[PDB]
Amino acid sequence: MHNVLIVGASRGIGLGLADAFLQRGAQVFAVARRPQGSPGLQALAERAGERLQAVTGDLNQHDCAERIGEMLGERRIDRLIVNAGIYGPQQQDVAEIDAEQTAQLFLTNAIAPLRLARALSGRVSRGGVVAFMSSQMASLALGLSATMPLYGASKAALNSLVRSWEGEFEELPFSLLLLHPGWVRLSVEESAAGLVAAVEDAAGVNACRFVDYRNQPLPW
Amino acid sequence: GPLGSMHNVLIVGASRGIGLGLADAFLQRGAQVFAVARRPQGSPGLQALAERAGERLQAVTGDLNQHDCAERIGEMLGERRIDRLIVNAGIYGPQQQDVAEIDAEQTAQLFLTNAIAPLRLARALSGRVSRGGVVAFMSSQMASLALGLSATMPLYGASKAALNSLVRSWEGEFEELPFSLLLLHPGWVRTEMGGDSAPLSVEESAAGLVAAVEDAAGVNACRFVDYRNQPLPW
Numbered sequence: 001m002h003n004v005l006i007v008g009a010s011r012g013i014g015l016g017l018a019d020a021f022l023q024r025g026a027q028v029f030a031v032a033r034r035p036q037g038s039p040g041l042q043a044l045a046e047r048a049g050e051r052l053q054a055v056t057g058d059l060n061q062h063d064c065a066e067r068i069g070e071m072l073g074e075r076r077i078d079r080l081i082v083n084a085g086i087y088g089p090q091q092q093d094v095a096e097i098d099a100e101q102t103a104q105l106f107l108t109n110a111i112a113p114l115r116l117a118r119a120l121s122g123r124v125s126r127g128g129v130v131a132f133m134s135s136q137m138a139s140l141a142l143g144l145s146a147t148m149p150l151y152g153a154s155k156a157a158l159n160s161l162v163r164s165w166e167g168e169f170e171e172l173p174f175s176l177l178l179l180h181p182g183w184v185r186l187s188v189e190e191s192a193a194g195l196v197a198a199v200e201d202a203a204g205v206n207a208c209r210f211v212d213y214r215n216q217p218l219p220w
Numbered sequence: 221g222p223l224g225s226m227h228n229v230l231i232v233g234a235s236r237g238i239g240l241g242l243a244d245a246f247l248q249r250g251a252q253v254f255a256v257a258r259r260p261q262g263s264p265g266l267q268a269l270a271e272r273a274g275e276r277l278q279a280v281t282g283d284l285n286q287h288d289c290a291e292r293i294g295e296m297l298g299e300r301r302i303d304r305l306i307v308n309a310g311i312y313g314p315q316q317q318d319v320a321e322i323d324a325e326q327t328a329q330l331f332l333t334n335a336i337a338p339l340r341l342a343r344a345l346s347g348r349v350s351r352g353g354v355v356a357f358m359s360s361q362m363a364s365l366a367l368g369l370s371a372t373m374p375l376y377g378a379s380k381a382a383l384n385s386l387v388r389s390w391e392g393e394f395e396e397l398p399f400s401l402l403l404l405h406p407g408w409v410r411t412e413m414g415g416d417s418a419p420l421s422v423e424e425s426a427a428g429l430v431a432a433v434e435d436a437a438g439v440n441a442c443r444f445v446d447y448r449n450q451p452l453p454w
């Protein structure tokens with residue numbers, strides 16, 4: 001049984017990933033801010049029993065890694081998926097975004113994901129996979145983020161920070177993935193099944209990849 | 221140029237370093253330069269340029285982080301159009317460049333100063349930019365995802381990737397660009413940010429950047445280029 005850690009698993013694609021990994025036979029550790037308040041996560045917990053361990057945790061809390069670690073004990077993480085993401089201000093307007101909103105956006109979407117992944121990295125299996133939920137809107141070459149520029153810039157910043165982390169290693173000890181889930185309203189189930197296949201395709205490769213739910217590369 | 225032409229060049233962040241070098245280099249080409257600085261009176265470099273160029277160098281008090289910056293620049297310009305708009309001002313972020321230690325206040329400061337405020341300002345002045353002009357943002361090779369050189373200064377690099385992203389998103393609002401949009405890498409330059417090991421003088425960096433800016437005039441394109449006018453990958 002692989003150990004899979006999904007950070008941000010109460011709903012949407014995060015929950016879908018927990019479900020999809022469970023269906024492959026993994027032991028899943030599913031972190032959410034309010035796990036008890038997610039009927040989706042509760043339903044998965046009931047069905048999988050002990051194979052789905054819900055964990056209360058918040059990416060933005062500085063003790064998050066410590067709490068996850070204490071919970072995991074000596075168990076190694078085969079697949080670490082950080083499914084951080086907020087939209088930022090609904091108007092996506094550079095003229096109006098304030099300091100508090102800027103901090104929240106870039107901490108949640110870019111900085112805290114790296115802080116957490118780095119802090120847990122000593123537990124990640126060699127030849128495993130660390131993946132971050134990114135977006136097509138992160139791509140500079142595609143340049144598709146005009147209607148949500150702040151969101152897209154936060155995901156470009158995430159991609160940048162992951163590339164910077166890669167640059168700290170002589171050779172990668174695990175793969176580093178930046179994931180585009182597709183434009184899910186495309187079901188969560190199809191997206192998650194695809195993303196699981198993309199993640200598993202990178203296991204043992206120790207490569208940096210920016211890929212979508214079909215395992216197709218996106219340009220930077 | 222001919223036809224009694226004298227380009228109006230606006231440099232945001234011109235008190236020292238590359239920004240001052242750009243003001244000097246544009247003045248040497250014959251431009252009317254509007255040099256925006258937080259404390260223009262406290263810059264010996266800008267005072268020296270003012271003495272040499274007289275009225276062809278107008279110092280303007282202004283701060284990229286202030287929401288009235290565009291208004292102050294506009295009031296100063298009157299009805300004049302901007303032929304070249306260069307946003308140079310930027311910060312390094314925390315000295316340690318460490319994702320584990322940066323706090324909320326520092327994160328806001330970094331991304332506002334290096335990414336969001338440049339777009340806020342440029343957008344607010346964009347109606348004044350000449351058709352066939354150039355709007356350029358000082359970016360960095362550390363912004364490039366393909367080069368993956370950002371490990372040296374990850375936070376700074378991420379803030380410039382965010383800048384690049386926002387400029388591309390702005391481009392994507394136009395059916396046809398009315399001016400060029402440039403992301404500039406100045407090289408590693410001997411300034412307070414670059415340090416004593418930097419291989420380029422301000423003078424050579426600025427001369428190169430002026431040539432790259434002028435090479436984009438009338439093209440109405442997006443480019444990510446260095447001080448030699450060589451393209452960088454995204």
Ligand SMILES: NC(=O)c1ccc[n+]([C@@H]2O[C@H](COP(=O)([O-])OP(=O)(O)OC[C@H]3O[C@@H](n4cnc5c(N)ncnc54)[C@H](OP(=O)(O)O)[C@@H]3O)[C@@H](O)[C@H]2O)c1
Pocket residue numbers: 232233234235236237238239240257258259282283284285308309310311333358359360361405406407408409410411412413414418
């Ligand atoms: N030097 C390099 O090697 C290098 C490499 C790549 C990219 N860059 C970029 O090039 C730009 C200029 O770099 P530099 O090396 O010349 O830095 P610098 O010598 O330290 O000068 C920074 C300039 O930015 C101004 N500034 C900072 N924050 C400002 C704000 N809110 N509002 C208005 N002005 C502000 C400063 O004015 P004050 O005097 O008031 O502080 C100063 O004129 C920056 O965007 C930097 O990121 C530099």
Ligand code: NA
Pocket residue numbers: 286287288289
């Ligand atoms: Na003000």
